[PDB]
Amino acid sequence: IWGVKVRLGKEKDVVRQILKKKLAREGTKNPLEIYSAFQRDSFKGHVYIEARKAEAINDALKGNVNVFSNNSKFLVGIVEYKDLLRPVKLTRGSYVRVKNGKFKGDLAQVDEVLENGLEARLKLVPRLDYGKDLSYTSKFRPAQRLFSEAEARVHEIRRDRDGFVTYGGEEYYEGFLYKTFRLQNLIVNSINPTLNELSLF
Amino acid sequence: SRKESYSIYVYKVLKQVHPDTGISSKAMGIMNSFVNDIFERIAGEASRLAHYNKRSTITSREIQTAVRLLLPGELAKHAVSEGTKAVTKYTSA
Amino acid sequence: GVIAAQSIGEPATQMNVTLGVPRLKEILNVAKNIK
DNA sequence: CCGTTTTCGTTGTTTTTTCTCGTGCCTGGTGTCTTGGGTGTAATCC
RNA sequence: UCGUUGUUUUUUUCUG
DNA sequence: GGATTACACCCAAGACACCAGGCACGAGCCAGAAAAAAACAACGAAAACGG
């Protein structure tokens, strides 16, 4: 396998070019002599093709503008070959954070992971103005507070259970926000608790 | 493996005498045998002549006298002339 | 020292052999091969 | 109602190939010496 | 009710 | 004249000077003034529209 540098961000495009030119030249008198090629997310900008002679690699990369023209290629050790093809903790009840939407930057507890595994429910802290400026964005969010039925009724509605209130499609259970959340919007690892979390949580 | 021969050297000598003349492999082997036997004969003559005078090293004069002893009059004289000319050229330059 | 520096530099501002600023520059740098 | 789509924010981020003056400092193949042994020579004996 | 702070970065045309 | 003590000397080896190119820097006055201009490509959400 040889790793030839390619243009930043266009590595999957280069992979597609390799595959499609390999398909189109098959059976001709000048086919592409390759076996298998891959790109890994960690190895960004690196294009790996399985072959036996550097001429095949040059042919594969020749004619691509999505590649750095230089033949900055290198070999891979026997033990290192499996490393390039080695691909490489989400549990309910553990605390995770949000990184998307208008509640981003707030620690939350998972309530339920969907059966398919595409949306993960969370236990967030509502950020409610109680209808003061209803007429949002991740730069104008005011302070945070637990949902209060009394204050919510006083200032601004349906009750389905004792302690559960449905407000604008959002779920408030024991003063904590429940909502469906995409798994791409959250991270379960690399969390250092903050001072406010210690004071409250 | 690395079984050295005098193939290319004989080829070059042949090219400078008869440039458009080929050769077979067995003729090449015959030439190798002839050259090796002559080398052994001259070296042995030099060794015996050194032993006779109880001298432990070899100079060019020993080879000269060995060639005189081995080959007959005219051929020995011509070899002497060629060797002297080559040695003098190798010395001055 | 400073007084000598200024007294020598200032006159130069007001100005076959070569004479004048080029000559002074050559002298100061100790040019090995003058023009 | 709701699935397709532009859309407002967010999030992330490089590469088609295209004039001046000086000292100082940093390299080679050269150049010249000189070393050491071994060959060259001859002076003496009998 | 003293207090009370105001950008950088380049480029330009100018003055002696 | 073979034998014998005596030595001539020289030539390859090795140490060193140096070497003229190239190769870099790296500098190239003072104070003051004004106006005029200053990143953005793509992305997945999320309101958007007719289905």
Side-chain angles (χ1 to χ4, degrees), chain A residues 80-127:
Chain A
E80 319 181 277
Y81 276 122
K82 66 95 167 176
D83 304 344
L84 292 167
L85 298 154
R86 288 221 62 242
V88 306
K89 301 174 176 183
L90 186 86
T91 59
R92 191 262 186 267
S94 185
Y95 285 121
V96 300
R97 213 177 263 283
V98 190
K99 302 145 51 172
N100 181 359
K102 278 72 70 177
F103 284 83
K104 61 153 288 293
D106 306 342
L107 201 72
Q109 182 181 182
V110 186
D111 290 323
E112 185 265 336
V113 291
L114 272 192
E115 192 276 331
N116 54 77
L118 181 52
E119 281 178 340
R121 284 272 295 280
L122 286 191
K123 168 176 199 174
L124 293 91
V125 177
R127 292 167 161 262

Coordinates of all heavy atoms in Angstrom, one line a residue, chain A residues 80-127:
Chain A
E80 N 2.2 -2.4 10.3 CA 1.4 -1.2 10.1 C 0.3 -1.3 9.1 O -0.6 -0.5 9.1 CB 2.4 -0.1 9.6 CG 3.8 -0.1 10.3 CD 4.6 1.0 9.8 OE1 5.3 0.9 8.7 OE2 4.7 2.1 10.4
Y81 N 0.3 -2.4 8.3 CA -0.8 -2.5 7.3 C -2.2 -2.6 8.0 O -3.1 -2.0 7.6 CB -0.5 -3.7 6.4 CG 0.4 -3.4 5.2 CD1 1.5 -4.1 5.1 CD2 0.1 -2.4 4.3 CE1 2.4 -3.9 4.0 CE2 0.9 -2.2 3.2 CZ 2.1 -2.9 3.1 OH 2.9 -2.7 2.0
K82 N -2.2 -3.5 9.0 CA -3.5 -3.6 9.7 C -3.9 -2.3 10.5 O -5.1 -2.1 10.7 CB -3.4 -4.8 10.7 CG -2.4 -4.6 11.9 CD -3.1 -4.0 13.1 CE -2.2 -4.1 14.3 NZ -2.9 -3.5 15.5
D83 N -2.9 -1.5 10.9 CA -3.2 -0.3 11.6 C -4.1 0.6 10.7 O -5.1 1.2 11.2 CB -1.9 0.4 12.0 CG -1.0 -0.4 12.8 OD1 -1.5 -1.5 13.3 OD2 0.2 -0.1 13.0
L84 N -3.7 0.8 9.4 CA -4.5 1.6 8.5 C -5.9 1.2 8.3 O -6.8 2.0 8.0 CB -3.8 1.7 7.2 CG -2.4 2.5 7.1 CD1 -1.7 2.2 5.8 CD2 -2.6 3.9 7.4
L85 N -6.2 -0.1 8.5 CA -7.5 -0.7 8.3 C -8.2 -1.0 9.6 O -9.2 -1.6 9.7 CB -7.4 -1.9 7.5 CG -6.9 -1.7 6.0 CD1 -6.3 -3.0 5.5 CD2 -8.0 -1.2 5.1
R86 N -7.6 -0.5 10.8 CA -8.3 -0.6 12.0 C -9.3 0.5 12.2 O -8.8 1.7 12.3 CB -7.3 -0.6 13.2 CG -6.4 -1.9 13.3 CD -6.2 -2.3 14.7 NE -7.5 -2.6 15.4 CZ -8.0 -2.0 16.4 NH1 -7.4 -1.0 17.0 NH2 -9.2 -2.4 16.9
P87 N -10.6 0.3 12.3 CA -11.5 1.4 12.5 C -11.2 2.2 13.7 O -11.1 3.4 13.6 CB -12.9 0.7 12.5 CG -12.6 -0.7 12.9 CD -11.3 -1.0 12.3
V88 N -11.1 1.6 14.9 CA -10.8 2.2 16.1 C -9.7 1.4 16.8 O -9.8 0.2 16.9 CB -12.0 2.4 17.1 CG1 -13.1 3.1 16.3 CG2 -12.5 1.1 17.6
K89 N -20.3 3.2 24.9 CA -19.9 4.2 25.8 C -21.0 5.2 26.0 O -20.8 6.2 26.7 CB -18.6 4.8 25.3 CG -17.5 3.9 25.1 CD -16.3 4.5 24.5 CE -15.1 3.5 24.4 NZ -13.9 4.2 23.8
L90 N -22.1 5.0 25.3 CA -23.3 5.9 25.5 C -24.3 5.1 26.3 O -24.9 4.1 25.9 CB -23.9 6.2 24.1 CG -25.1 7.2 24.1 CD1 -24.6 8.7 24.1 CD2 -26.0 7.0 22.9
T91 N -24.6 5.6 27.6 CA -25.4 4.9 28.5 C -26.4 5.9 29.1 O -26.1 7.1 29.5 CB -24.6 4.3 29.6 OG1 -23.8 5.3 30.3 CG2 -23.6 3.3 29.1
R92 N -27.6 5.5 29.3 CA -28.7 6.3 30.0 C -28.3 6.4 31.4 O -27.7 5.5 32.1 CB -30.0 5.6 29.8 CG -31.2 6.5 30.2 CD -31.6 6.2 31.7 NE -32.8 7.0 32.0 CZ -32.8 8.1 32.7 NH1 -31.7 8.7 33.0 NH2 -34.0 8.7 33.0
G93 N -28.7 7.6 32.0 CA -28.4 7.9 33.4 C -27.1 8.6 33.6 O -26.9 9.3 34.7
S94 N -26.2 8.6 32.7 CA -24.9 9.4 32.7 C -25.2 10.8 32.1 O -26.0 10.9 31.2 CB -23.8 8.7 32.0 OG -22.6 9.4 32.2
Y95 N -24.4 11.7 32.6 CA -24.6 13.1 32.3 C -23.8 13.4 31.0 O -22.6 13.1 30.9 CB -24.1 14.0 33.4 CG -25.1 14.1 34.6 CD1 -24.7 13.8 35.8 CD2 -26.4 14.5 34.4 CE1 -25.5 13.8 36.9 CE2 -27.3 14.6 35.5 CZ -26.8 14.2 36.7 OH -27.7 14.3 37.8
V96 N -24.5 14.1 30.0 CA -23.9 14.5 28.8 C -24.3 15.9 28.5 O -25.1 16.5 29.2 CB -24.4 13.6 27.6 CG1 -24.1 12.1 27.8 CG2 -25.9 13.8 27.4
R97 N -23.6 16.5 27.6 CA -23.8 17.9 27.2 C -24.4 18.1 25.9 O -24.4 17.2 25.0 CB -22.5 18.7 27.3 CG -22.6 20.2 27.8 CD -21.3 20.9 27.9 NE -20.8 20.9 29.3 CZ -21.3 21.7 30.3 NH1 -22.3 22.5 30.0 NH2 -20.8 21.6 31.5
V98 N -24.9 19.3 25.6 CA -25.5 19.7 24.3 C -24.5 20.6 23.6 O -23.8 21.4 24.2 CB -26.9 20.3 24.5 CG1 -27.6 20.5 23.1 CG2 -27.7 19.5 25.5
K99 N -24.5 20.5 22.3 CA -23.6 21.3 21.4 C -24.4 21.9 20.2 O -23.7 22.5 19.4 CB -22.4 20.5 20.9 CG -21.6 19.9 22.1 CD -21.0 18.5 21.6 CE -20.3 18.6 20.3 NZ -19.6 17.3 20.0
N100 N -25.7 21.9 20.2 CA -26.4 22.3 19.0 C -27.7 23.0 19.5 O -28.1 22.8 20.7 CB -26.8 21.2 18.1 CG -27.6 21.7 16.9 OD1 -27.9 22.9 16.7 ND2 -27.9 20.7 16.0
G101 N -28.3 23.9 18.7 CA -29.5 24.5 19.0 C -29.3 25.7 20.0 O -28.3 26.3 20.1
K102 N -30.4 26.0 20.7 CA -30.5 27.2 21.5 C -30.1 26.8 23.0 O -29.9 27.7 23.8 CB -31.8 27.8 21.5 CG -32.0 28.8 20.3 CD -32.1 28.0 18.9 CE -33.4 27.3 18.8 NZ -33.5 26.6 17.5
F103 N -30.1 25.5 23.3 CA -29.7 25.1 24.7 C -28.3 24.6 24.7 O -27.9 23.9 25.7 CB -30.7 24.0 25.2 CG -32.0 24.5 25.6 CD1 -33.0 24.8 24.7 CD2 -32.3 24.7 26.9 CE1 -34.3 25.2 25.1 CE2 -33.5 25.2 27.3 CZ -34.5 25.5 26.4
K104 N -27.5 24.8 23.7 CA -26.2 24.3 23.6 C -25.3 24.8 24.8 O -25.5 26.0 25.2 CB -25.5 24.6 22.3 CG -25.4 26.1 22.0 CD -24.2 26.4 21.1 CE -22.8 26.2 21.8 NZ -22.6 27.2 22.9
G105 N -24.5 23.9 25.3 CA -23.7 24.3 26.5 C -24.3 24.0 27.8 O -23.9 24.6 28.8
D106 N -25.3 23.1 27.9 CA -26.0 22.8 29.1 C -25.9 21.3 29.3 O -26.3 20.5 28.5 CB -27.5 23.2 29.0 CG -27.6 24.7 28.7 OD1 -26.7 25.4 28.8 OD2 -28.8 25.1 28.3
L107 N -25.4 20.9 30.5 CA -25.3 19.5 30.9 C -26.7 18.9 31.0 O -27.7 19.6 31.4 CB -24.6 19.3 32.2 CG -24.0 17.9 32.4 CD1 -22.8 17.7 31.5 CD2 -23.6 17.8 33.9
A108 N -26.9 17.6 30.6 CA -28.2 17.0 30.6 C -28.0 15.5 30.9 O -26.9 15.0 30.8 CB -28.9 17.2 29.3
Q109 N -29.1 14.9 31.3 CA -29.1 13.4 31.6 C -30.0 12.7 30.5 O -31.1 13.2 30.3 CB -29.6 13.1 33.0 CG -29.6 11.6 33.3 CD -30.2 11.4 34.7 OE1 -30.2 10.2 35.2 NE2 -30.6 12.4 35.4
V110 N -29.5 11.7 29.9 CA -30.2 10.9 29.0 C -31.4 10.3 29.6 O -31.3 9.7 30.7 CB -29.3 9.9 28.3 CG1 -30.1 9.2 27.1 CG2 -28.1 10.5 27.8
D111 N -32.6 10.4 29.0 CA -33.8 9.7 29.5 C -34.1 8.4 28.8 O -34.6 7.5 29.4 CB -35.0 10.7 29.3 CG -35.0 11.9 30.2 OD1 -34.6 11.7 31.4 OD2 -35.4 13.0 29.8
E112 N -33.9 8.3 27.5 CA -34.2 7.1 26.7 C -33.6 7.2 25.3 O -33.8 8.2 24.7 CB -35.7 6.9 26.6 CG -36.1 5.6 26.0 CD -36.4 5.7 24.5 OE1 -36.7 6.9 24.0 OE2 -36.3 4.7 23.7
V113 N -32.9 6.2 24.9 CA -32.3 6.1 23.6 C -33.3 5.4 22.7 O -33.8 4.3 23.0 CB -30.9 5.4 23.6 CG1 -29.9 6.3 24.3 CG2 -31.0 4.1 24.2
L114 N -33.6 5.9 21.5 CA -34.6 5.4 20.6 C -34.2 3.9 20.3 O -33.1 3.5 20.4 CB -34.7 6.2 19.3 CG -35.7 7.3 19.3 CD1 -35.9 7.8 17.9 CD2 -37.0 7.0 19.9
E115 N -35.2 3.1 20.0 CA -35.0 1.7 19.7 C -34.1 1.6 18.5 O -33.2 0.7 18.5 CB -36.4 1.0 19.4 CG -36.3 -0.5 19.4 CD -35.9 -1.0 18.0 OE1 -36.2 -0.4 17.0 OE2 -35.3 -2.1 18.0
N116 N -34.3 2.4 17.5 CA -33.3 2.4 16.3 C -31.9 2.9 16.7 O -30.9 2.3 16.3 CB -33.9 3.3 15.2 CG -34.2 4.7 15.7 OD1 -33.3 5.5 15.8 ND2 -35.5 4.9 15.9
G117 N -31.9 3.9 17.5 CA -30.6 4.5 17.9 C -30.2 5.7 17.2 O -29.0 5.9 16.9
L118 N -31.2 6.6 16.8 CA -30.9 7.8 16.0 C -31.2 9.1 16.8 O -30.5 10.1 16.6 CB -31.7 7.8 14.7 CG -31.6 9.0 13.8 CD1 -30.1 9.2 13.5 CD2 -32.4 8.8 12.5
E119 N -32.1 9.0 17.7 CA -32.5 10.2 18.6 C -32.4 9.7 20.0 O -32.9 8.7 20.4 CB -33.8 10.7 18.3 CG -33.9 11.6 17.0 CD -35.3 12.1 16.7 OE1 -36.3 11.5 17.2 OE2 -35.5 13.1 16.0
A120 N -31.7 10.5 20.9 CA -31.5 10.2 22.3 C -32.2 11.3 23.1 O -31.9 12.5 23.0 CB -30.0 10.2 22.6
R121 N -33.1 10.8 24.0 CA -33.8 11.7 24.9 C -32.9 12.2 25.9 O -32.0 11.5 26.4 CB -35.0 11.0 25.5 CG -36.2 10.9 24.5 CD -37.1 12.1 24.6 NE -37.8 12.3 25.9 CZ -38.8 11.6 26.2 NH1 -39.4 10.7 25.4 NH2 -39.4 11.8 27.5
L122 N -33.1 13.5 26.4 CA -32.3 14.1 27.4 C -33.1 14.8 28.5 O -34.3 14.9 28.3 CB -31.4 15.2 26.8 CG -30.2 14.7 25.9 CD1 -29.3 15.9 25.6 CD2 -29.4 13.6 26.6
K123 N -32.5 15.1 29.6 CA -33.1 15.8 30.7 C -32.4 17.1 30.9 O -31.4 17.2 31.6 CB -33.0 14.9 32.0 CG -33.3 15.6 33.3 CD -33.2 14.7 34.5 CE -34.0 15.2 35.7 NZ -34.1 14.2 36.8
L124 N -32.9 18.1 30.2 CA -32.3 19.4 30.2 C -32.9 20.4 31.2 O -33.9 20.0 31.8 CB -32.4 20.0 28.8 CG -31.6 19.4 27.7 CD1 -32.4 18.3 27.0 CD2 -31.1 20.4 26.6
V125 N -32.3 21.5 31.4 CA -32.8 22.6 32.3 C -33.5 23.6 31.4 O -32.9 24.2 30.5 CB -31.7 23.2 33.1 CG1 -32.3 24.3 34.0 CG2 -31.0 22.2 34.0
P126 N -34.8 23.8 31.5 CA -35.5 24.8 30.7 C -34.9 26.2 30.8 O -34.5 26.6 31.9 CB -37.0 24.7 31.2 CG -37.1 23.5 31.9 CD -35.8 23.2 32.5
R127 N -35.0 26.9 29.7 CA -34.6 28.3 29.6 C -35.8 29.1 29.2 O -36.0 29.3 28.0 CB -33.4 28.6 28.7 CG -32.1 28.0 29.2 CD -31.0 28.0 28.1 NE -29.7 27.8 28.7 CZ -28.9 28.8 28.9 NH1 -29.2 30.1 28.6 NH2 -27.7 28.6 29.4

